[PDB]
């Protein structure tokens, strides 16, 4: 079956800087968009980064200018780098995937997340 599988979380101090990656397999990686969520303690899942293998990546509001996405079509990869974190950036960070022909807010496959503290 298909597994995403984040790598790379853990605890950061404020001003700091994290790497996630997510490992994919299972399903045609280079055709479907790759995206980061996060959800932080009893809030809803918020959308961090999505990027195509066309080039194409963006970000949520909250972190554009301070997080970078990239993939690796060759080695089925993607990567949030994550500068000069916050507090308010502490939550579990997930992985997922969504078919190209599947509505724009519709991810087929989830990782089961990776924790990212940021404290003091």
């Known amino acids: 079956e298909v597994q995403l599988v984040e790598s790379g979380g853990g605890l950061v101090q404020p001003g700091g800087s994290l790497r996630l990656s997510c490992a994919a397999s299972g399903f045609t990686f280079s055709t479907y968009a790759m995206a980061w969520f996060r959800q932080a303690p009893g809030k809803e899942r918020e959308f961090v980064a999505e990027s195509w293998s066309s080039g194409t990546t963006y970000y949520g509001a909250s972190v554009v200018g301070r997080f970078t996405m990239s993939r690796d079509d060759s080695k089925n990869t993607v990567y949030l780098q994550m500068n000069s974190l916050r507090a308010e950036d502490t939550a579990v960070y997930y992985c997922?995937?969504?078919?190209?022909?599947?509505?724009?807010?519709?991810?087929?496959?989830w990782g089961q997340g990776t924790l990212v503290t940021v404290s003091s």
């Open positions: 997922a995937a969504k078919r190209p022909d599947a509505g724009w807010q519709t991810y087929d496959y």
